[PDB]
RNA sequence: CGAGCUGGAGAUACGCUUUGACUCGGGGAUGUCCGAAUGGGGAAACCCACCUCGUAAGAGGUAUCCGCAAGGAUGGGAACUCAGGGAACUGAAACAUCUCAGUACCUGAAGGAGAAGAAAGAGAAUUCGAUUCCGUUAGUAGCGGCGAGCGAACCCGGAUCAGCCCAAUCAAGCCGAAGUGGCUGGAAAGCUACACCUCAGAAGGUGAGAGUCCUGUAGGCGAACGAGAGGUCGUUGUUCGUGAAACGAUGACUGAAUCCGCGCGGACCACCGCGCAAGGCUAAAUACUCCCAGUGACCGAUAGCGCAUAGUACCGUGAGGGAAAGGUGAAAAGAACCCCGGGAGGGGAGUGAAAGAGAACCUGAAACCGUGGACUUACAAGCAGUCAUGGCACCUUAUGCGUGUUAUGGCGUGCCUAUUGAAGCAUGAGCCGGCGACUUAGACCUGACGUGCGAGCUUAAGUUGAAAAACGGAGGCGGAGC
RNA sequence: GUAGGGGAGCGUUCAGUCCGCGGAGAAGCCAUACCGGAAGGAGUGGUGGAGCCGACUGAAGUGCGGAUGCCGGCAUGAGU
């Protein structure tokens, strides 16, 4: 059986050139009028997971994409 | 798993033929084929010979009584002989007449 | 780097698998080889496969007995095998270059023997084993060795075969096993100037 | 291929059992209780190698004290007596002197009470 | 029969169980627990019963395959090919085997000698540096 | 075929057979009664009739459905095929959509295959051209309480190739090379000395292991008979879960054009492309394996099928469940006869190489039961051991580091499991013997070790060969990221 | 030194090859004071009556005291 790709992880995770794993910062959908404008700015973004969380994601998409 | 199975139920000699005893205790003694059973591959030759016992039965006769009769042998200790050589001999199938198949050696025939 | 016998004597060709032949790669090639031909035909029954009804034998608690559900179980005499062999296959694809380097290194090994004997033409009358025996005898094949013969001529093979100590191989039926199995190799030689280039 | 037990289990078993002769009742005839008895035997063997070294020292000491006191001396005072006069004897040996050779042990006594004076 | 495999080619497997040698009793598995048990399952992305990291993270953007360009470098074509030239069926026989995708040329490292190239697109600084060395770049019609 | 035969059965008698038996191959004749059962009935294998011929004996006919007739159908068949109907456990660490799964099961029809098939197509090159199957694309595109998880197709490479008609050689069998002498042994195949055939050294049988003793093998011969439309509502199919939902598919209602016409191309329109629905058949590649043959790093009597045969004994009203089972000897020469006993059993004798093989018959372990002998025990508190010493005994890895056995002293809380903590009055266990538990798979993922190539590396299906392997570049991995 | 990780090995069937034994007697069984660091391994003798050891290599249905485990035989309770 070919190991399947974890379709949830498709739109939320990114493989990197070196071989680290990325995602988008969170809290941006109704936690808005908070705000602060620098939070709202800092959140829409993107960023690298701390580390412990790497193996799993890697196993989520074997193809990298 | 019958004895003839290995030898295709086939006798390499007929009844009434003379035979030399190849192997065993009666090496080389000679005799007439008195009885030959193909499927079992067993053959009687006036030379083997044992002492059998008739136990109780009042037929034949109340008392026991012992007896001297030959005990059949396994085909593979039997061979056709060759009047010249006089010895243990193989066989070739050649022809005669008038539709008869016959048996030769290295110098036919028996 | 070596001579023929009957109908010429060239053979200085063929580069060879140095340093002085390696057994490691040989091993690779041979175990692969035997693996490739295993029947993989061992087969046993498991719990699903034993003819035992699946009905519960008696009550889960009560009885005073230990608990069981079925008599088709691997802790049960006459049951299933827990972890038996089912028919499988062992045949993989060893990298080509390694098969090639192998065969090569076989010939090379048998060269430093020197148990190579390159041969041209032969001379066995018309398909007779006695004549194979005399031919062999003229070439130093006493009988005290096991010999692999490779040729494309129907009748020379047809003459060797029935000899206990000769194993007979047509064309490119060659392989590291069969070779390394035997002592002497009859190459022949016609195939050698092509199996260099 | 399959590989039965064939022969191994019985060889193991007989090994244990044959270690176990002279054991009482089932302890020498049933495998498991043999094997078991033997675990405890393990403990006892190891222990008692050390412990017999403990025991014999004891014995020597007893005898020594005895001889010491025959000639009017305690053991302890006898042994400081010996160390003082730098006589350097094993107590195994001191015991054997004490038990086997009277006059000699006597001489060591006098030497030691001298070393004490 | 003479032969032997390489030291360190073949490690003998783990036979867990088989006595106090040895991994006794529990065969690695530890004492009790769901991990101890014998069943196919958990599996791998199951944290606690909780609420999973991947499930807590925002999805971004759709998905699209689009077209992907097969990369050819300068530095490849340059230094030591001695221009056997590009064409179409020539590149393959040298080294840039793909099919099904259009070819692109990108800057890489260095340019000097002039060559004629046949790609499907290329970068600005690549056409610029290939011309400034005397070579032309061919895009299709 | 050519001398034996009279089934397993081995047992006495009768006898058959060179006028060709027995066995093998091939056709016919006979073929009671039941079972689709079909004359009517019926609790299968039994009861009762009617008609035509016949002297009676006997023979033949008497079901239902399609058809004028001829003739066809009914029933059965392990798996495999299609069709009508269609689960749940379970997974989602609860559950309802979802998943298990169109799986299990039920019914139907049919064959040695079946299905499918001759584009109102796939598709995006104005490319391809019936279907099925394998590889691959590819866990990609997509689906999804966007959770669990589900998951194509096109291209490309293979296997096999096909498209036509209608409505205005194998199955019996025969021939078939080459060795003798001495030695061990109960027995020769083994040993030994010389010797031969090999297109034949595959294999089995022969008193132990046989190329050359038998059957055979390579090779050759071989038969009279024998065989080769659209719509709306309600739904669903494929990746298709109402999603923007195309398309097919019908249950209900409704219902157009026929060539400047019609149908598609993922709402929908134009344009540009592909297509001729509503009429049928079609071999080949594919599936399966009751049966047959060959093979095996499959099993050899708790193994392997449940069976060294039995769906039996046995259990159950029934559906249904369901065992254990093996071995004299080379050859029955299967122990005449004598002794004790009603017999059973045994002791002789005799046979045998061996009865240290006697029919409760290969080896014959352990638990467990006894006889005999050594040293020992009737003032003793004990997880039975262990250490130390003394006594007796014994001398084939043995006169010392001894072997057996003991007296007395010191010391000592069974094993396993589970636990903070086990001698525990916590779990398991009568005993010994056997069976008994971390494996397999994928051409998946990720490391360690090793090997081959190395800026390159590799093939898969398959093709051919096959006492081997070689081809096969389709594909896949590196090569650039964001 | 418990869970656990790591390392070097012992023994079992089957397989390839090499060595080689075996009716002046194999495997199996039985006794034993010898050998090896341990799994274990030999020597001799008794049994048995036809097959088998050692070495290297390969593949496993490969090692038992437990599971109120399974099949089987035989104990206890009891001359009750
Ligand atoms: Mg059985
Ligand atoms: Mg101390
Ligand atoms: Mg370990
Ligand atoms: Mg345990
Ligand atoms: Mg536990
Ligand atoms: Mg716990
Ligand atoms: Mg006949
Ligand atoms: Mg009727
Ligand atoms: Mg439920
Ligand atoms: Mg659930
Ligand atoms: Mg039917
Ligand atoms: Mg609808
Ligand atoms: Mg649907
Ligand atoms: Mg429609
Ligand atoms: Mg047995
Ligand atoms: Mg009697
Ligand atoms: Mg006694
Ligand atoms: Mg008292
Ligand atoms: Mg007393
Ligand atoms: Mg507690
Ligand atoms: Mg603990
Ligand atoms: Mg207690
Ligand atoms: Mg207790
Ligand atoms: Mg408890
Ligand atoms: Mg109890
Ligand atoms: Mg590496
Ligand atoms: Mg330690
Ligand atoms: Mg072997
Ligand atoms: Mg054996
Ligand atoms: Mg037990
Ligand atoms: Mg109980
Ligand atoms: Mg029992
Ligand atoms: Mg009484
Ligand atoms: Mg009582
Ligand atoms: Mg009473």
> What residues form DSSP beta bridges with B37?
B42
CA of D66 to C1' of F379 (A): 32
Element (H, E) at A43: helix A37-43
Is residue E20 within 8 Å of A35, Cβ to Cβ? no
Residue E73: both structure tokens together: 């470098």
Best probe of the A interface among E52, E58, E64, E68, by most A CBs < 10 A, is E58
Nucleotide nearest to D13 (CA to C1'): F366
Cβ distance of A24 and E45 shorter than 8 Å: no
Question: What's the gap in Å between A2 CA and the centre of ligand 18?
Answer: 86
Count the domains in chain E: 1
- The CA angle C142-C143-C145, to the nearest 5 degrees, is 105
Best probe of the A interface among E48, E51, E52, E60, by most A CBs < 10 A, is E60
SS3 D11: helix
Residue D73: both structure tokens together: 């001396």
Nucleic strand F near CB of residue B102 (< 7 Å): no
Using CA atoms of C8, C9, C15, C16 in order, give the dihedral in degrees to the nearest 10. 110
Of A11, A26, A57, the CB nearest to E56: A26
Residue E44 lies in domain? 1-141
SS3 C116: strand
Is residue C87 within 8 Å of C67, Cβ to Cβ? no
Of E44, E59, E62, the CB nearest to A12: E59
> What residues form DSSP beta bridges with B36?
B43
CA distances from E101 to C138, E3, E88, E107, E120 (A): 67, 49, 13, 19, 10
- CB-side exposure of E7: number of CA atoms within 13 Å? 0
Chains that touch D (3 or more CB pairs under 8 A): none
Query: Which domains are present in chain A?
Result: 1-65 (4.10.410.60)
Residues 6 or more apart whose CB falls under 8 angstroms from that of D4 comprise none
Of A24, A29, A59, the CB nearest to E57: A24
Q: Resolution of the coordinates in A?
A: 2.9
Whole-angstrom Cα Rg for chain C = 27
Distance CA B28, CA B49 (A): 15
Residue bearing tokens 């193991």: D12
Is residue B83 within 8 Å of B110, Cβ to Cβ? yes
Of E45, E61, E62, the CB nearest to A6: E45
SS3 E97: coil
Cβ distance of C24 and E9 shorter than 8 Å: yes
Is residue E74 within 8 Å of E130, Cβ to Cβ? yes
Best probe of the A interface among E44, E53, E56, E66, by most A CBs < 10 A, is E53
A26 vs E contacts (CB less than 8 Å):
56-58
In degrees and rounded to multiples of 5, residue B7 shows phi and psi of: -115, 35
Residue B58: both structure tokens together: 């009042």
Indicate the pairing of strand C116-119 with strand C184-189.
parallel
> What residues form DSSP beta bridges with B101?
B95
> What residues form DSSP beta bridges with A23?
A47
E40 touches chain A (CB under 8 A): no
Q: Do chains B and A touch (3 or more CB pairs under 8 A)?
A: no
* Residues 86-125 of C, Cβ under 7 A from nucleic strand F: 86, 88-101, 103
CA distances from B35 to B38, C2, C8 (A): 10, 68, 67
CA of B46 to C1' of F1 (A): 29
> What residues form DSSP beta bridges with C189?
C119
Is residue C159 within 8 Å of C132, Cβ to Cβ? yes
Distance CA E139, CA E57 (A): 43
Total Cβ atoms within 10 A of residue D98: 24
Indicate the pairing of strand B42-45 with strand B73-74.
antiparallel
Nucleic strand F near CB of residue D35 (< 7 Å): no
Using CA atoms of C28, C30, C35, C39 in order, give the dihedral in degrees to the nearest 10. 180
Question: What's the gap in Å between D39 CA and the centre of ligand 4?
Answer: 14
DSSP string covering E48-94, please? Answer: SSS--HHHHSPP-S-------PEEEEHHHHSTTT-----TTHHHHHH
Closest CA-bearing residue to C1' of F322:
C52
Residues 6 or more apart whose CB falls under 8 angstroms from that of B12 comprise B75, B78, B79, B80, B91
Distance CA A27, CA A45 (A): 11
Distance CA C166, CA C132 (A): 10
In degrees and rounded to multiples of 5, residue D34 shows phi and psi of: -55, -60
Nucleotides of G under 7 A from a protein CB: 2-9, 11-18, 28-32, 39-41, 55-71
First vs last Cα of chain E: how many Å apart?
66
Is residue C36 within 8 Å of C177, Cβ to Cβ? no
Total Cβ atoms within 10 A of residue E69: 16
CA distances from A39 to A31, A42, C19 (A): 10, 5, 69
SS3 C170: strand
Count of pairs with CB atoms under 8 A, one residue in A, one in E: 37
Distance CA B102, CA B109 (A): 7
Cα D9 vs. chain centroid, distance in angstroms?
A: 37
Distance CA C190, CA A10 (A): 62
Report the residue of chain E nearest A53, measured CA to CA. E53
Nucleotides of F under 7 A from a protein CB: 2-5, 18, 91-93, 138-144, 146-151, 155, 174-181, 186-189, 197-202, 204-207, 210, 213-216, 295-300, 302-307, 311, 320-324, 330-337, 350-353, 365-368, 383-388, 404-406, 409-412, 414-419, 431-446, 448-453, 455-460, 465-473, 475, 477-482
Is residue E103 within 8 Å of E69, Cβ to Cβ? yes
Total Cβ atoms within 10 A of residue C56: 11
CA distances from D87 to C27, C113, D74, D108 (A): 73, 78, 17, 9
DSSP string covering B52-108, please? Answer: EE--S-STT-SS--EEEE---EEGGG-B-B-TTT-SB---EEEEETTTEEEEE-SS-
Cβ distance of E4 and C180 shorter than 8 Å: no
Residue bearing tokens 């890697």: A58
Cβ distance of E57 and A26 shorter than 8 Å: yes
Question: What's the gap in Å between E49 CA and the centre of ligand 20?
Answer: 30
Technique behind the model: X-ray
Report the residue of chain C nearest E3, measured CA to CA. C23
Residue C84: both structure tokens together: 């038996």
Q: Do chains D and A touch (3 or more CB pairs under 8 A)?
A: no
Indicate the pairing of strand B18-20 with strand B30-37.
antiparallel
């Amino acid at each position: 059986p070919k190991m399947k790709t974890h379709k949830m992880a498709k739109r939320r995770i990114k493989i990197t050139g070196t071989g680290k794993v990325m995602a988008f910062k969170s809290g941006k959908r109704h936690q808005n009028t908070g705000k602060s404008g620098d939070e709202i700015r800092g959140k829409g973004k993107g960023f690298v997971l701390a580390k412990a969380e790497w193996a799993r994601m890697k196993l989520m998409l074997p193809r990298g994409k | 798993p019958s004895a003839g199975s290995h030898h295709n139920d086939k006798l390499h000699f007929k009844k009434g033929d003379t035979v030399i005893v190849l192997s065993g205790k009666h090496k080389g003694q000679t005799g007439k084929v008195l009885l030959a059973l193909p499927r079992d591959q067993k053959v009687v030759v006036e030379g083997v010979n044992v002492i059998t016992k008739n136990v109780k039965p009042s037929m034949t006769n109340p008392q026991g009584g012992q007896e001297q009769r030959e005990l059949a042998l396994h085909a593979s200790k039997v061979a056709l002989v060759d009047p010249e050589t006089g010895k243990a001999t193989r066989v070739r199938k050649q022809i005669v007449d008038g539709k008869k198949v016959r048996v030769a050696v290295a110098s036919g025939k028996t | 780097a070596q001579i023929n016998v009957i109908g010429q004597n060239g053979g200085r060709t063929i580069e060879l698998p140095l340093p002085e032949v390696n057994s490691g790669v040989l091993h690779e090639v041979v175990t692969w080889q035997l693996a490739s031909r295993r029947r993989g035909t061992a087969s046993t029954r498991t719990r699903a496969q034993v003819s035992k009804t699946g009905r519960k034998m008696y009550g889960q608690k009560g009885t005073g007995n230990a608990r069981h559900g079925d008599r088709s179980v691997p802790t049960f005499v006459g049951g299933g095998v827990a972890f038996g062999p089912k028919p499988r296959s062992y045949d993989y694809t060893l990298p080509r270059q390694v098969r090639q380097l192998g065969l090569a290194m076989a010939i090379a090994s048998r060269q430093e023997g020197g148990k190579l004997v390159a041969v041209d033409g032969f001379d066995i009358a018309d398909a007779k084993t006695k004549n194979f025996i005399s031919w062999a005898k003229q070439n130093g094949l006493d009988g005290t060795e096991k010999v692999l013969l490779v040729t494309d001529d129907e009748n020379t093979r047809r003459a060797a075969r029935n000899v206990s100590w000769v194993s007979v191989l047509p064309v490119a039926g060659v392989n590291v096993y069969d070779i390394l199995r035997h002592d002497r190799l009859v190459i022949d030689a016609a195939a050698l100037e092509i199996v260099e280039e | 291929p399959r590989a039965k037990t064939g022969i191994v289990r019985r060889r193991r078993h007989k090994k244990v059992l044959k270690r176990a002769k002279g054991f009482w009742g089932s302890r020498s005839k049933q495998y498991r209780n043999a094997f078991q008895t033997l675990l405890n035997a393990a403990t006892y063997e190891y222990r008692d190698r050390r412990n017999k070294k403990r025991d014999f020292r004891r014995l020597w000491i007893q005898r020594i004290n005895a001889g010491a006191r025959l000639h009017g001396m305690n053991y302890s005072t006898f042994i400081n007596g010996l160390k003082r006069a730098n006589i350097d004897l094993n107590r195994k040996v001191l015991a054997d002197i004490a038990a086997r050779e009277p006059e000699a042990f006597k001489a060591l006594v006098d030497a030691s009470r001298n070393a004490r004076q | 029969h003479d032969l032997k495999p390489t030291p360190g080619s073949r490690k003998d497997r783990k036979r867990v169980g088989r006595g106090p040698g040895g991994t006794d009793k529990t065969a690695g598995r530890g004492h009790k627990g769901q991990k101890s048990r014998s069943g196919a399952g958990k599996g791998a992305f199951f944290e606690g019963g909780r609420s999973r990291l991947i499930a807590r993270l925002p999805k971004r953007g759709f998905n699209n395959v689009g077209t992907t360009y097969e990369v050819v470098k300068l530095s490849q074509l340059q230094d030591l090919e001695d221009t056997t030239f590009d064409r179409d069926t020539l590149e393959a026989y040298r080294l840039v085997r793909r099919k099904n995708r259009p070819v692109k040329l990108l800057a890489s490292g260095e340019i000097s000698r002039a060559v004629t190239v046949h790609v499907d697109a290329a970068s600005a600084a690549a056409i610029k540096a290939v011309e400034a060395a005397g070579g032309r770049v061919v895009l299709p019609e």
